[PDB]
Amino acid sequence: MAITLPKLKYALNALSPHISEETLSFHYNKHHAGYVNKLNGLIKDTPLANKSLTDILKESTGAIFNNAAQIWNHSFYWDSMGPNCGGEPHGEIKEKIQEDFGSFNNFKDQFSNVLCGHFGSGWGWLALNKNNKLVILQTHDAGNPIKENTGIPILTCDVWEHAYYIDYRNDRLSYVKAWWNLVNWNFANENLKNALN
Amino acid sequence: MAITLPKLKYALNALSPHISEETLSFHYNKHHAGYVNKLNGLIKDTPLANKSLTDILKESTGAIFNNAAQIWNHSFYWDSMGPNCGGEPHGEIKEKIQEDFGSFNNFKDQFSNVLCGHFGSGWGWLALNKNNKLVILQTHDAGNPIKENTGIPILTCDVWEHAYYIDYRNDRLSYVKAWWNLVNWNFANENLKNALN
Ligand SMILES: [Mn+2]
Ligand SMILES: [Mn+2]
Ligand SMILES: [Zn+2]
């Protein structure tokens, strides 16, 4: 089985007006697909040729790692959002956030601050750390908490300029605000359950 | 004198269709201006408050350096381009590129390769090294050859996504091709002459 672009769990216009169908079209069909295509080009006729994405992520370095990790990161980004989502958390993730951050609003303010403050290309993460505490992390470029052994990812938000430039230009703040309307708490709950078990 | 945004030496539509009017307006009036404004905000009421950009570049770290460096980098980028420019080099820079790269075409293909393969936010540089040889360099985020002590800058091209996303989206290759129509060989000659003297 060749490594492939996993399917979005919703339509290309499903996140609008918060993220436009045009953005998803480029972000998914050009950027995300391109990472898959480029990785497959790089590993062809190498000892990594028949490896799974998981194996590649563990073993590889350089541009091979960068493309592989971007594939994984973008799939986690799509899964971290959806239609008829956003708002206040619910379920276990509501308990866990209010516990570890005091309140949802405290978390949301800190997470927004990190997303808005990140310099250059990268990612913001909600993750569960080794002490089973929720933490906010940020990574540069293709970095993530799995590769960096800093925690188990629960949610992520992309802050590469290509994630928002079409809809928001330089106004990353407006993008981050829009993103809270999309956050998939069901995905967070599933990741949290699996992370604790 | 407070640190200020240097004036552009050309109109905001002087580089179209290679770089659009809209790109210059966001890139200069929002991004570059923003680095000036953020720098000035950060040094206010600190020991760096009344320092010049030059002083701040040699002393500072973290966000302060990032903003200061980006101010310098963008000013260098605007000066590296112009209307009625582009094409084959001329003057001393022609001789120098011919010698150090064998030909203009070899330099151009290498520099294009470096500009296109750079992962994440960054810059490509033509620079004079300590052996008075021209070299191709790349830096991440706000990095530049002065800070990194790797060479004296001659020309630069911005490859942060915001430099090209408005006009080309993910197609950095088209942006890089367009940029060769803009490269200011007169600036390259002035830089090379000051660097050798
Ligand atoms: Mn992305
Ligand atoms: Mn820029
Ligand atoms: Zn032209």
Short mmCIF file of C-alpha atoms and ligand atoms in Angstrom, two decimals:
data_model
loop_
_atom_site.label_atom_id
_atom_site.label_comp_id
_atom_site.label_asym_id
_atom_site.label_seq_id
_atom_site.Cartn_x
_atom_site.Cartn_y
_atom_site.Cartn_z
CA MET A 1 0.00 0.00 0.00
CA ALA A 2 1.40 3.34 -1.17
CA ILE A 3 1.10 6.17 1.35
CA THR A 4 -1.94 8.24 0.37
CA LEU A 5 -3.73 11.47 1.13
CA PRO A 6 -6.38 10.51 3.71
CA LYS A 7 -9.87 11.70 2.88
CA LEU A 8 -11.33 14.76 4.57
CA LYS A 9 -14.23 13.88 6.84
CA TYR A 10 -16.31 16.72 5.40
CA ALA A 11 -16.90 18.79 2.25
CA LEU A 12 -14.44 21.47 1.02
CA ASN A 13 -16.96 24.20 1.95
CA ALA A 14 -17.79 22.66 5.35
CA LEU A 15 -15.66 25.08 7.40
CA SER A 16 -16.85 28.29 5.78
CA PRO A 17 -17.09 31.14 6.39
CA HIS A 18 -14.42 30.54 9.03
CA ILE A 19 -12.12 28.82 6.53
CA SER A 20 -13.22 29.26 2.93
CA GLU A 21 -13.62 26.48 0.40
CA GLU A 22 -10.86 28.16 -1.58
CA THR A 23 -8.47 27.83 1.30
CA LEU A 24 -9.33 24.16 1.88
CA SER A 25 -8.96 23.54 -1.82
CA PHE A 26 -5.40 24.87 -1.85
CA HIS A 27 -4.50 23.72 1.60
CA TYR A 28 -5.74 20.13 1.06
CA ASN A 29 -5.44 19.55 -2.69
CA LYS A 30 -2.16 21.42 -3.23
CA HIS A 31 -0.20 21.64 0.03
CA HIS A 32 -1.29 18.44 1.81
CA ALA A 33 -1.34 16.36 -1.41
CA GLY A 34 2.06 17.80 -2.39
CA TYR A 35 3.64 16.58 0.83
CA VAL A 36 2.34 13.07 0.06
CA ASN A 37 3.53 13.25 -3.57
CA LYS A 38 6.94 14.67 -2.60
CA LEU A 39 7.51 12.07 0.12
CA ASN A 40 6.62 9.29 -2.34
CA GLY A 41 9.05 10.79 -4.86
CA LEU A 42 11.80 10.98 -2.24
CA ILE A 43 11.49 7.40 -0.95
CA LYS A 44 11.10 5.70 -4.33
CA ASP A 45 14.16 3.55 -5.07
CA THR A 46 15.48 4.00 -1.51
CA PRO A 47 15.47 1.58 1.43
CA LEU A 48 12.39 3.48 2.66
CA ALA A 49 10.47 2.71 -0.54
CA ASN A 50 8.05 0.17 1.00
CA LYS A 51 7.75 1.64 4.52
CA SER A 52 4.53 2.88 6.10
CA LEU A 53 4.12 6.49 7.12
CA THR A 54 4.51 5.48 10.77
CA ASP A 55 7.79 3.70 10.11
CA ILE A 56 9.04 6.65 8.07
CA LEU A 57 8.18 9.11 10.83
CA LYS A 58 10.20 7.09 13.34
CA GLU A 59 13.23 6.39 11.12
CA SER A 60 13.77 9.36 8.78
CA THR A 61 15.46 12.77 8.80
CA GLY A 62 15.75 15.86 6.57
CA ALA A 63 13.23 16.52 3.81
CA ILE A 64 11.93 12.96 4.02
CA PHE A 65 11.00 13.58 7.66
CA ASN A 66 9.68 17.05 6.92
CA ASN A 67 7.25 15.84 4.22
CA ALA A 68 6.13 12.76 6.17
CA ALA A 69 5.51 14.84 9.32
CA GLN A 70 3.60 17.51 7.35
CA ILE A 71 1.29 14.76 6.02
CA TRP A 72 0.61 13.55 9.53
CA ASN A 73 0.31 17.09 10.94
CA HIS A 74 -2.19 18.19 8.28
CA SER A 75 -4.34 15.09 8.80
CA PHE A 76 -4.42 15.95 12.49
CA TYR A 77 -5.35 19.54 11.64
CA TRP A 78 -8.32 18.47 9.44
CA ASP A 79 -9.47 16.06 12.17
CA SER A 80 -9.18 18.79 14.81
CA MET A 81 -11.92 20.76 13.00
CA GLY A 82 -15.35 20.24 11.51
CA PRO A 83 -18.79 21.60 10.74
CA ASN A 84 -21.30 21.87 13.61
CA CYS A 85 -18.43 22.03 16.06
CA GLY A 86 -16.66 24.89 17.89
CA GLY A 87 -18.18 26.50 20.98
CA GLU A 88 -17.50 25.30 24.51
CA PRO A 89 -15.95 21.91 25.11
CA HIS A 90 -18.06 19.02 26.40
CA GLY A 91 -17.38 15.59 27.89
CA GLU A 92 -14.06 14.50 29.39
CA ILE A 93 -12.17 17.25 27.57
CA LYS A 94 -14.32 19.85 29.33
CA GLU A 95 -13.37 18.36 32.72
CA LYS A 96 -9.74 18.04 31.78
CA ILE A 97 -9.34 21.60 30.45
CA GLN A 98 -11.14 23.25 33.31
CA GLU A 99 -9.01 21.14 35.70
CA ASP A 100 -5.60 21.69 34.06
CA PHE A 101 -6.20 25.35 33.06
CA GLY A 102 -8.73 26.37 35.72
CA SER A 103 -11.29 27.25 33.04
CA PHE A 104 -11.96 26.91 29.32
CA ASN A 105 -11.59 30.67 28.84
CA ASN A 106 -8.10 30.62 30.47
CA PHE A 107 -7.09 27.85 28.06
CA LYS A 108 -8.58 29.59 25.05
CA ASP A 109 -6.76 32.85 25.87
CA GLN A 110 -3.38 31.10 26.33
CA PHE A 111 -3.82 28.95 23.24
CA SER A 112 -4.76 32.00 21.15
CA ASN A 113 -1.78 33.91 22.52
CA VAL A 114 0.60 31.09 21.57
CA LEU A 115 -0.96 30.71 18.10
CA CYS A 116 -0.80 34.46 17.47
CA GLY A 117 2.70 34.82 18.91
CA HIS A 118 4.38 32.02 17.00
CA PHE A 119 7.14 33.43 14.84
CA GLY A 120 7.57 31.92 11.35
CA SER A 121 5.97 28.65 10.21
CA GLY A 122 4.66 26.13 12.75
CA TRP A 123 1.90 24.59 14.82
CA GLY A 124 0.08 24.99 18.09
CA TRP A 125 -0.86 21.89 20.03
CA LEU A 126 -3.02 20.84 22.91
CA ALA A 127 -1.30 17.74 24.21
CA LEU A 128 -1.37 15.43 27.20
CA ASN A 129 2.05 15.28 28.87
CA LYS A 130 3.83 12.42 30.68
CA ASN A 131 2.19 13.35 34.00
CA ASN A 132 -1.24 13.09 32.31
CA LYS A 133 -1.66 16.86 32.35
CA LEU A 134 -2.90 18.91 29.39
CA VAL A 135 -0.31 21.39 28.10
CA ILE A 136 -0.03 23.91 25.30
CA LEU A 137 2.88 23.36 22.96
CA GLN A 138 4.16 25.00 19.83
CA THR A 139 6.51 23.59 17.21
CA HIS A 140 8.41 25.09 14.28
CA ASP A 141 7.91 24.10 10.63
CA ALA A 142 7.11 20.31 10.52
CA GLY A 143 7.78 19.63 14.20
CA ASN A 144 5.27 17.84 16.44
CA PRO A 145 5.00 16.50 20.01
CA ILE A 146 5.33 12.87 18.92
CA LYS A 147 8.66 13.36 17.18
CA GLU A 148 9.76 15.68 20.00
CA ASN A 149 8.58 13.34 22.82
CA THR A 150 6.82 16.29 24.53
CA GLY A 151 3.31 14.86 24.68
CA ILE A 152 0.43 13.01 23.06
CA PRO A 153 -1.43 15.36 20.62
CA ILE A 154 -5.09 16.12 21.33
CA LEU A 155 -5.74 19.05 18.96
CA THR A 156 -3.60 21.15 16.61
CA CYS A 157 -3.91 24.38 14.67
CA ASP A 158 -1.73 25.24 11.67
CA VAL A 159 -0.16 28.70 11.71
CA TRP A 160 1.84 28.47 8.52
CA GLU A 161 0.83 31.60 6.52
CA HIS A 162 -0.70 29.38 3.83
CA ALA A 163 -3.30 28.24 6.38
CA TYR A 164 -4.87 31.73 6.47
CA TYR A 165 -3.39 34.05 3.88
CA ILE A 166 -6.17 33.55 1.33
CA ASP A 167 -8.97 34.46 3.75
CA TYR A 168 -7.19 36.74 6.28
CA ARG A 169 -3.97 37.91 4.64
CA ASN A 170 -1.66 39.06 7.47
CA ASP A 171 -4.46 39.09 10.05
CA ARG A 172 -3.64 35.85 11.82
CA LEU A 173 -5.65 37.07 14.83
CA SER A 174 -8.86 36.94 12.84
CA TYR A 175 -8.00 33.44 11.61
CA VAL A 176 -7.40 32.18 15.16
CA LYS A 177 -10.69 33.70 16.25
CA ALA A 178 -12.45 31.98 13.33
CA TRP A 179 -10.75 28.70 14.23
CA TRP A 180 -12.48 28.47 17.62
CA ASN A 181 -15.77 28.11 15.68
CA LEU A 182 -14.37 24.91 14.13
CA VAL A 183 -12.61 23.05 16.92
CA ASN A 184 -13.72 19.43 17.02
CA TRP A 185 -14.20 18.50 20.69
CA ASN A 186 -15.29 14.99 19.75
CA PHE A 187 -11.88 14.38 18.21
CA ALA A 188 -10.25 15.84 21.35
CA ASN A 189 -12.28 13.46 23.53
CA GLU A 190 -11.35 10.43 21.42
CA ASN A 191 -7.67 11.34 21.49
CA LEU A 192 -7.83 11.95 25.24
CA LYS A 193 -9.51 8.61 25.90
CA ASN A 194 -6.96 6.74 23.80
CA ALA A 195 -4.08 8.70 25.40
CA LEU A 196 -5.05 7.79 28.95
CA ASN A 197 -5.74 4.14 28.11
CA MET B 1 15.97 59.33 15.89
CA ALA B 2 13.23 56.72 16.39
CA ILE B 3 13.57 53.64 14.19
CA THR B 4 11.31 54.09 11.18
CA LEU B 5 10.16 52.24 8.06
CA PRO B 6 12.43 53.27 5.21
CA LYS B 7 10.58 54.67 2.17
CA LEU B 8 10.32 52.48 -0.93
CA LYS B 9 12.36 53.74 -3.87
CA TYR B 10 9.52 52.86 -6.23
CA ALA B 11 5.70 52.80 -6.44
CA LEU B 12 3.73 49.89 -4.97
CA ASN B 13 2.79 48.76 -8.52
CA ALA B 14 6.28 49.13 -9.97
CA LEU B 15 7.07 45.39 -9.78
CA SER B 16 3.88 43.96 -11.34
CA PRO B 17 3.09 41.49 -12.78
CA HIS B 18 6.14 39.84 -11.20
CA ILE B 19 5.17 40.97 -7.71
CA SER B 20 1.70 42.50 -7.52
CA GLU B 21 0.67 45.89 -6.15
CA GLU B 22 -1.44 44.12 -3.56
CA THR B 23 1.57 42.06 -2.43
CA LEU B 24 3.74 45.15 -1.96
CA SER B 25 1.00 46.88 -0.01
CA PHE B 26 0.53 43.99 2.45
CA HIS B 27 4.23 43.05 2.53
CA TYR B 28 5.45 46.64 3.05
CA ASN B 29 2.50 48.43 4.77
CA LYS B 30 1.52 45.51 7.03
CA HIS B 31 4.40 43.07 7.48
CA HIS B 32 7.46 45.37 7.22
CA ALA B 33 5.71 48.26 9.00
CA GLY B 34 4.55 45.77 11.62
CA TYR B 35 8.11 44.69 12.38
CA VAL B 36 9.03 48.34 12.94
CA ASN B 37 6.00 48.94 15.14
CA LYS B 38 6.53 45.75 17.15
CA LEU B 39 10.23 46.46 17.65
CA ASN B 40 9.49 49.97 18.91
CA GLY B 41 6.83 48.54 21.24
CA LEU B 42 9.21 45.93 22.67
CA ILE B 43 12.13 48.34 23.39
CA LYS B 44 10.00 51.06 24.87
CA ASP B 45 10.92 51.53 28.56
CA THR B 46 13.88 49.11 28.34
CA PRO B 47 17.62 49.81 28.12
CA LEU B 48 17.33 49.49 24.31
CA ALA B 49 14.70 52.24 23.97
CA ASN B 50 17.02 54.83 22.45
CA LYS B 51 19.27 52.45 20.47
CA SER B 52 19.55 52.51 16.70
CA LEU B 53 18.60 49.46 14.64
CA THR B 54 22.30 48.69 14.09
CA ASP B 55 22.97 48.77 17.85
CA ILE B 56 19.91 46.56 18.51
CA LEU B 57 20.94 44.02 15.84
CA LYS B 58 24.34 43.49 17.47
CA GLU B 59 23.06 43.33 21.09
CA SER B 60 19.55 41.82 21.18
CA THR B 61 17.99 38.33 21.32
CA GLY B 62 14.60 36.62 20.94
CA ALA B 63 11.59 38.54 19.65
CA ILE B 64 13.52 41.84 19.74
CA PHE B 65 16.18 40.48 17.38
CA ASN B 66 13.56 38.79 15.20
CA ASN B 67 11.70 42.02 14.65
CA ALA B 68 14.87 44.06 14.18
CA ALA B 69 16.39 41.56 11.78
CA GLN B 70 13.17 41.39 9.75
CA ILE B 71 13.21 45.17 9.44
CA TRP B 72 16.75 45.00 8.04
CA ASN B 73 16.04 41.95 5.88
CA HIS B 74 12.96 43.54 4.25
CA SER B 75 14.71 46.82 3.56
CA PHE B 76 17.48 44.77 1.92
CA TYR B 77 14.88 42.86 -0.09
CA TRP B 78 13.23 46.01 -1.45
CA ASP B 79 16.66 47.38 -2.41
CA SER B 80 17.49 44.06 -4.08
CA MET B 81 14.65 44.70 -6.53
CA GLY B 82 13.38 47.44 -8.80
CA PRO B 83 11.60 48.44 -12.00
CA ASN B 84 13.63 48.47 -15.25
CA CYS B 85 15.93 45.85 -13.71
CA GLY B 86 16.21 42.08 -14.04
CA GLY B 87 17.90 40.26 -16.90
CA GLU B 88 21.59 39.48 -17.17
CA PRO B 89 23.90 41.08 -14.64
CA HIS B 90 26.34 43.81 -15.71
CA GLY B 91 29.32 45.62 -14.23
CA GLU B 92 31.57 44.12 -11.60
CA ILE B 93 28.84 41.74 -10.41
CA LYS B 94 28.73 40.14 -13.87
CA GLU B 95 32.50 39.46 -13.79
CA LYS B 96 32.30 38.26 -10.18
CA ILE B 97 29.38 35.83 -10.75
CA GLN B 98 31.04 34.51 -13.93
CA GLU B 99 34.19 33.79 -12.00
CA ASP B 100 32.70 32.40 -8.80
CA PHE B 101 29.95 30.30 -10.42
CA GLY B 102 31.40 29.77 -13.90
CA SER B 103 28.49 31.61 -15.47
CA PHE B 104 25.32 33.57 -14.73
CA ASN B 105 23.14 30.58 -15.72
CA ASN B 106 24.85 28.27 -13.21
CA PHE B 107 24.45 30.83 -10.43
CA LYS B 108 20.81 31.41 -11.38
CA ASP B 109 19.91 27.72 -11.43
CA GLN B 110 21.66 27.07 -8.11
CA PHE B 111 20.09 30.10 -6.40
CA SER B 112 16.67 29.14 -7.75
CA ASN B 113 17.18 25.60 -6.44
CA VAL B 114 18.07 26.96 -2.98
CA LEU B 115 15.13 29.42 -2.98
CA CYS B 116 12.69 26.66 -4.02
CA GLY B 117 13.94 23.93 -1.70
CA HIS B 118 13.96 26.04 1.47
CA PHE B 119 11.52 24.52 3.95
CA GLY B 120 9.44 26.89 6.05
CA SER B 121 10.02 30.62 6.40
CA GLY B 122 13.34 32.08 5.33
CA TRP B 123 15.61 33.93 2.97
CA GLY B 124 18.09 33.19 0.19
CA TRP B 125 21.23 35.31 -0.07
CA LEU B 126 23.97 36.13 -2.48
CA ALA B 127 26.87 37.01 -0.19
CA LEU B 128 30.60 37.74 -0.22
CA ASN B 129 32.48 35.36 2.06
CA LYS B 130 35.70 36.01 3.99
CA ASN B 131 37.75 34.68 1.05
CA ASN B 132 36.12 37.37 -1.13
CA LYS B 133 34.23 34.70 -3.02
CA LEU B 134 30.51 35.02 -3.77
CA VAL B 135 28.47 32.30 -2.09
CA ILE B 136 24.83 31.26 -1.96
CA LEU B 137 23.36 31.13 1.56
CA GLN B 138 20.01 30.49 3.12
CA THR B 139 18.63 31.40 6.53
CA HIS B 140 15.58 30.45 8.52
CA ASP B 141 12.94 32.87 9.74
CA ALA B 142 14.71 36.19 10.60
CA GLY B 143 18.24 34.92 10.14
CA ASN B 144 20.81 36.77 8.04
CA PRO B 145 24.58 36.35 7.15
CA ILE B 146 25.67 39.33 9.26
CA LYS B 147 24.20 37.94 12.46
CA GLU B 148 25.36 34.43 11.54
CA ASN B 149 28.78 35.80 10.49
CA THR B 150 28.75 33.85 7.21
CA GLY B 151 29.11 36.64 4.67
CA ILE B 152 28.46 40.17 3.50
CA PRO B 153 25.01 40.36 1.86
CA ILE B 154 24.84 41.37 -1.81
CA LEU B 155 21.24 40.42 -2.67
CA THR B 156 18.37 38.61 -0.94
CA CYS B 157 15.03 37.14 -1.88
CA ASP B 158 12.26 36.60 0.70
CA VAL B 159 10.69 33.12 0.67
CA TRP B 160 8.27 33.53 3.60
CA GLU B 161 4.90 32.48 2.13
CA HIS B 162 3.57 36.09 2.51
CA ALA B 163 6.07 37.28 -0.07
CA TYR B 164 4.23 35.33 -2.78
CA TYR B 165 0.97 33.77 -1.58
CA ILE B 166 -1.24 36.59 -2.84
CA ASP B 167 0.00 36.19 -6.42
CA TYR B 168 1.16 32.57 -6.70
CA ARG B 169 -0.19 30.66 -3.65
CA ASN B 170 1.82 27.48 -3.24
CA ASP B 171 3.66 27.94 -6.55
CA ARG B 172 6.94 29.32 -5.21
CA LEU B 173 8.64 28.30 -8.48
CA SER B 174 6.67 30.90 -10.43
CA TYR B 175 7.48 33.51 -7.81
CA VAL B 176 11.20 32.68 -8.04
CA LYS B 177 11.04 32.86 -11.86
CA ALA B 178 9.28 36.22 -11.60
CA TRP B 179 11.87 37.54 -9.17
CA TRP B 180 14.68 37.24 -11.78
CA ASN B 181 12.82 39.96 -13.75
CA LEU B 182 13.20 42.26 -10.72
CA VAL B 183 16.74 41.73 -9.42
CA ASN B 184 18.59 45.04 -8.99
CA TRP B 185 22.14 44.58 -10.32
CA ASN B 186 22.99 48.20 -9.46
CA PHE B 187 22.38 47.46 -5.78
CA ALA B 188 24.47 44.29 -6.15
CA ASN B 189 27.30 46.38 -7.63
CA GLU B 190 27.17 48.96 -4.82
CA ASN B 191 27.17 46.21 -2.20
CA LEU B 192 30.05 44.34 -3.80
CA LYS B 193 32.14 47.50 -4.12
CA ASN B 194 31.56 48.53 -0.48
CA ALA B 195 32.28 44.96 0.64
CA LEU B 196 35.61 44.74 -1.18
CA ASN B 197 36.82 48.23 -0.15
MN MN C 1 -0.65 23.78 6.33
MN MN C 2 8.68 39.21 4.09
ZN ZN C 3 9.49 43.16 -16.01
#
